[PDB]
Amino acid sequence: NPKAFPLADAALTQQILDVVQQAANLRQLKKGANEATKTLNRGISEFIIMAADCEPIEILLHLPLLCEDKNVPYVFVPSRVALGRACGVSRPVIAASITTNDASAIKTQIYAVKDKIETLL
Amino acid sequence: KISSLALITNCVQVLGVKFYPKIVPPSIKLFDASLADSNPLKEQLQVAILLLFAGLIKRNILDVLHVIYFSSSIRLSVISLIIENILKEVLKVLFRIWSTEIDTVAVSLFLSTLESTVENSATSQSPIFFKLLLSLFEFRSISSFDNNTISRIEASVHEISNSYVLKMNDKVFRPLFVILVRWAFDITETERLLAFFKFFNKLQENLRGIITSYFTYLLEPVDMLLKRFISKDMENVNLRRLVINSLTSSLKFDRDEYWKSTSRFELISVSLVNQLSNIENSIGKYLVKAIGALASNNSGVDEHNQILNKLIVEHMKASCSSNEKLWAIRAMKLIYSKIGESWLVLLPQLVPVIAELLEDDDEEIEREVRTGLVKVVENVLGEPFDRYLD
Amino acid sequence: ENPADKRRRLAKQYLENLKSEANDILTDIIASRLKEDVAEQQGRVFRYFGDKLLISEAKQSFTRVGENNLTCISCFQPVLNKYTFEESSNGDKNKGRLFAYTVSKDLQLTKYDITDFSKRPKKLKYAKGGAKYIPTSKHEYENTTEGHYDEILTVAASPDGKYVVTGGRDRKLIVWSTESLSPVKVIPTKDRRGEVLSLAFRKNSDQLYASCADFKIRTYSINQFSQLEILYGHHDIVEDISALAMERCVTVGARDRTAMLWKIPDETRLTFRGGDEPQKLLRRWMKEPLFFCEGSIDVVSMVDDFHFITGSDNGNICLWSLAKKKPIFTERIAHGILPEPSFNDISGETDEELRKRQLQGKKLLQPFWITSLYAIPYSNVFISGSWSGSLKVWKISDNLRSFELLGELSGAKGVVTKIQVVESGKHGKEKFRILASIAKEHRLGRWIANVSGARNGIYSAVIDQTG
Amino acid sequence: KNKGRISRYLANKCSMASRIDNYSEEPSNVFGSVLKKQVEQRLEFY
Amino acid sequence: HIAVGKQIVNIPSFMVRLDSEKHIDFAPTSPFGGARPGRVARRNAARKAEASGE
Amino acid sequence: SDAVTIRTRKVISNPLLARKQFVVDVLHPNRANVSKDELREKLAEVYKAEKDAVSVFGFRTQFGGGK
RNA sequence: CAUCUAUAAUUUUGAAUAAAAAUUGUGCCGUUGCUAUGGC
């Protein structure tokens, strides 16, 4: 898929899914395509993780428009099943959004991974 | 057939809305119809007989209940209807219909009637009830049933007898108690003793200690039975369990110093220690509980303690059997744990016995002696035992 | 009449049996057999049937079950004591009746008889939960409703053959009798997020290590129905647990990718981390394909008291020794990569070449997940499983530095939730049943539902040995 | 109540259909048809 | 109420490390992450039980 | 709920004073402060010595409790 | 857990029913034969 342009390599996926898992435990994370779109319109999203093997790809390809329109970093990971396991819900999630909060224990990791994604863009 | 059924239910309706010389002749005719019948039409006929019975008992009772018995849930419900509507006459009905009885469903109906009667004076109802008890034990003797079935029946008759005697006042069935003992000691009669002693233990536990004069009536033939046991004429493990358990309950419940009497005391003590001689390895805990109860009852009297200790060391003499030795050892352990204070004076009559037992080779008895007896006696004395045992 | 003489009599009959079996084998040896029957106690792998097995004719038998989503299986196998000499089982009406206990997401616990190695597992008895066991307070320590009310998730049968203990997402842990399946005791985990994920009895004892999902590992004692201890130290959910005859249990926690070995009486632990890198593997292979990163360590089994194998989620099967922190021998994607998604399904666009361009070739490949992994204890083979529809039997070397694929078994189809092996026969002639609880979904979450031909059931595969 | 259920269900499937039809050059009656079949199975469930 | 691993801490100036920061949780003695409710709750419950008894 | 768990460390066989000296870790959750009498009975059962031989002293409960 | 009982097996009597001794692979549907496998 060339439409999934920024696709993470292995180590980048590992870092991203670890940050997603910590953000889910702290509950700084919003799961699902519609909930991620709502967070983006609210302007409270830190950054966007999407799946790549979603069936099909357009139903979340609607997101990069809003993503760089409000200038939010976004990334694609290969497996929506991996994304669901990392989010910590029993169903495969195709798009998750780390929100913004600075009274948060994982601010440093969030900023590191967001910087690395932005460099990949 | 259907015309007869319509006649029956029409009588049901018209008597429900509703004479006795026109009311008992249809009862006789209904008896005749029931005995003539005794096929689905016949079943519904039986149902209609029972409903007309239900109406008349709502608003020859022996034969009525006879047909009610021999004629399922409908039967149980109409039994309850009988007993809420209608009792000494009912008890006479129970006895006569039981002599008529002696199958299984009729037996269950009979027992349900009995339990309903007792949960529903009693001095007047007593002798018919006790004759019914004896007749049920004779049924246990001669029934063509299975063991678990008759044991279900015996458990039911035991619990209803406990309820009835509990309802009864205590001074008035005293001669009835004497005649019950007379029936029990005068079927192979081992079953008589068995049922009577189940009954007696349950009564002793329920009434809790006002059975002392009844055991005063009882003490001689039970001593004859204990002597039969120690001579090993009988062998009934459960009967011996029952005798010893009754004796325990009486000893532990006597709070009137009744067992401070010397003659009864020496009788029961001699019989119990010889029972320890002829004991069997299952009932040993029962017998050591018995001897501990006897000692805790006669704790105040030193000569009683002395003859107790003499009998026990006589039976734990080192030249004896392993089981008798070990059970006497457990009895001594229990006694010294319980009383422990009226026995230090008796203690120097027992160290040579301990020495020979420790020297014995059967390491079960050796370990039992060492651990149990020496640790409980060392704890009683405080400072250790190795100044007596050199 | 003396207990020492009774022990001597049983030992003399045992020696008669040993000499007779030595003669029948002949149609040194007895000393080696005695040293073996003791050498179970030392912590070194000795059971060396790594090449006597005949996998190519291992007879497979699927048994479909009624309920949905079997979650775990644990099979009780009676053995003989060497100290006393009666048996492992309790009753006399059992006499070595191989039993199996299966727990399933339908809240159903079921005991099968598996005593015969030719016929199918016969369903002896069962007990089902439901919603009538929901606690009335719901906000308290008291959770002791006699049944299960939500998602039982692990079972384990005690070695004495009296109890079997089940635990699930309802944060209780119930010990049931083995005959009537009656619940004799119920222990709440007393925690809001303390869901019980995996149990493991200490072998030939009654201590039970119950890896909960609140980052802690509770240890109990079933003969007294008590909770001895709580062990702390994992940074994610303590996913899987395994223990042997010693006072150690190895636990793998998933997202932290960490295997920790708990020495219980020393009250200490050892931490093992993985750490392979795609750049190092790529440069090393250039010095010589795909290299998947390590997401999470899913399952563990202790092969021996100094070595254990961890099946990760990214195809890795590692073998670790207690001396070296890094894995002494890794093994790459062990059940293959997953099949690629369809071009039409991944694009939704008429242009066929654009659909293939969506599929991208290699970049969207993910390896099979080693769902289950069981090392038959103190021995040199172990069974791995994924939803590849194929159990994989592997064999460790003699120097315990590597292992090789001994064989495959293709009768299974679905997610292999739990593998459990049972041996029987005479000491030289030992048949090995391999039960496997197979279900359509994973044990923990759903995450997958489209497996072609996956049916809920017990895959029983009997192997024999000739050598 | 089930009117509101069906309304929200149809709204979500409509949103997904609009996504694929805007970002697919030559869109697919097959995905449209399977999504319609899904909604029809829900309406049969009513 | 709050333990770091196994140890109940009640010092608000404890200066955690990274592993401890992952290990912080409620304590097993407390009514919050564990055992029986406090004296206020169970005294209120005893009061309501006696008031329903009368 | 409650089961006192005794473990011993640093077991030094000291044959000069004819003894075995160790360090006793007691775990008593949902409880407090098991007795020296109970510890001596249990250590006698473990080590197969007599309660008159066993001696213990110097116990210290940790903050929070349970050990 | 043991005992007892129950179902199911032999024995004897009777052509046999009958009598008693006495003893000791699925929740739903699908293909498919004398067990194997589809889908929900």
Swiss-Prot record, chain A:
Outcome, altering residue 55 to A: Impairs binding to U4 snRNA, but not U3 snoRNA. Causes pre-mRNA splicing and pre-rRNA processing defects
A GO biological process held by the record: maturation of SSU-rRNA
SUPFAM superfamilies reported for this sequence: L30e-like
Record GO terms (molecular function): RNA binding; U3 snoRNA binding; U4 snRNA binding
Keyword presence, Repeat: no
Protein's recorded name: 13 kDa ribonucleoprotein-associated protein
Family designation: Belongs to the eukaryotic ribosomal protein eL8 family.
Function: Common component of the spliceosome and rRNA processing machinery. In association with the spliceosomal U4/U6.U5 tri-snRNP particle, required for splicing of pre-mRNA. In association with box C/D snoRNPs, required for processing of pre-ribosomal RNA (rRNA) and site-specific 2'-O-methylation of substrate RNAs. Essential for the accumulation and stability of U4 snRNA, U6 snRNA, and box C/D snoRNAs.
Domain of life: Eukaryota
Subunit structure: Binds to the C'/D and B/C motifs in U3 snoRNA. Component of the U4/U6-U5 tri-snRNP complex composed of the U4, U6 and U5 snRNAs and at least PRP3, PRP4, PRP6, PRP8, PRP18, PRP31, PRP38, SNU13, SNU23, SNU66, SNU114, SPP381, SMB1, SMD1, SMD2, SMD3, SMX2, SMX3, LSM2, LSM3, LSM4, LSM5, LSM6, LSM7, LSM8, BRR2 and DIB1. Binds to the 5'-stem-loop of U4 snRNA. Component of the ribosomal small subunit (SSU) processome composed of at least 40 protein subunits and snoRNA U3.
Keyword Transcription: no
Short name of one Pfam family: Ribosomal_L7Ae
PANTHER family referenced in this protein's UniProt entry, alphabetically: RIBOSOMAL PROTEIN L7AE FAMILY MEMBER (PTHR23105)
Compartment(s): Nucleus, Nucleolus
Main localization, broad class: nucleus
Swiss-Prot record, chain C:
Entry's localization field: Nucleus, Nucleolus
The organism's place on the tree of life at top rank: Eukaryota
Gene3D superfamilies in the cross-refs: YVTN repeat-like/Quinoprotein amine dehydrogenase
Keywords: Acetylation, Coiled coil, Nucleus, Phosphoprotein, Repeat, Ribonucleoprotein, Ribosome biogenesis, rRNA processing, WD repeat
The keyword Signal is annotated on this UniProt entry: no
A single GO BP: endonucleolytic cleavage to generate mature 5'-end of SSU-rRNA from (SSU-rRNA, 5.8S rRNA, LSU-rRNA)
Broad class of where this protein is predominantly found: nucleus
Segments annotated as WD repeats: 147-186, 191-230, 233-272, 292-330, 366-404, 411-457
PROSITE patterns: WD_REPEATS_2 (PS50082), WD_REPEATS_REGION (PS50294)
A molecular function (GO) term: U3 snoRNA binding
Pfam families, alphabetized: WD40
Presence of keyword Hydrolase: no
Entry's Gene Ontology cellular component terms: 90S preribosome; box C/D methylation guide snoRNP complex; nucleolus; nucleoplasm; small-subunit processome
Subunit structure: Interacts with UTP25. Component of the ribosomal small subunit (SSU) processome composed of at least 40 protein subunits and snoRNA U3.
Protein function: Involved in nucleolar processing of pre-18S ribosomal RNA. Required for efficient pre-rRNA cleavage at sites A0, A1 and A2, and biosynthesis of 18S rRNA.
Domains: entry comment: The WD domains are required for nucleolar localization and U3 small nucleolar RNAs binding.
PANTHER family, per database record: U3 SMALL NUCLEOLAR RNA INTERACTING PROTEIN 2, U3 SMALL NUCLEOLAR RNA-INTERACTING PROTEIN 2
More info: Present with 5130 molecules/cell in log phase SD medium.
Family membership: Belongs to the WD repeat RRP9 family.
Name of the protein in question: Ribosomal RNA-processing protein 9
Name of encoding gene: RRP9
UniProtKB/Swiss-Prot annotation, chain E:
Shown chain mapped onto the complete sequence: 133 to 186 of 197
Protein's recorded name: Small ribosomal subunit protein uS4A
Entry's family note: Belongs to the universal ribosomal protein uS4 family.
Coiled coil region boundaries: none
Domain of life: Eukaryota
Modified residues (Phosphoserine): 52
Biological source species: Saccharomyces cerevisiae (strain ATCC 204508 / S288c) (Baker's yeast)
Region (Disordered): 28-54
Miscellaneous notes: Present with 106000 molecules/cell in log phase SD medium.
Record's signal peptide: none
Subcellular location per the Swiss-Prot or TrEMBL entry: Cytoplasm; Nucleus, Nucleolus
Swiss-Prot record, chain F:
Protein localization: Cytoplasm
Domain of life (superkingdom): Eukaryota
PTM sites of type Phosphoserine: 13, 55
Post-translational modification comment from the UniProt entry: N-terminally acetylated by acetyltransferase NatA. Also partially acetylated by NatC.
Sequence position, cross-link Glycyl lysine isopeptide (Lys-Gly) (interchain with G-Cter in ubiquitin): 20
Coiled-coil portions: none
Chain positions with N-acetylserine modification: 1
Transmembrane residue ranges: none
Function: Component of the ribosome, a large ribonucleoprotein complex responsible for the synthesis of proteins in the cell. The small ribosomal subunit (SSU) binds messenger RNAs (mRNAs) and translates the encoded message by selecting cognate aminoacyl-transfer RNA (tRNA) molecules. The large subunit (LSU) contains the ribosomal catalytic site termed the peptidyl transferase center (PTC), which catalyzes the formation of peptide bonds, thereby polymerizing the amino acids delivered by tRNAs into a polypeptide chain.
Note: There are 2 genes for eS24 in yeast.
Assembly description: Component of the small ribosomal subunit (SSU). Mature yeast ribosomes consist of a small (40S) and a large (60S) subunit. The 40S small subunit contains 1 molecule of ribosomal RNA (18S rRNA) and 33 different proteins (encoded by 57 genes). The large 60S subunit contains 3 rRNA molecules (25S, 5.8S and 5S rRNA) and 46 different proteins (encoded by 81 genes).
Assigned protein family: Belongs to the eukaryotic ribosomal protein eS24 family.
Protein name: Small ribosomal subunit protein eS24A
Interval of the full protein contained in this chain: 2 to 68 of 135
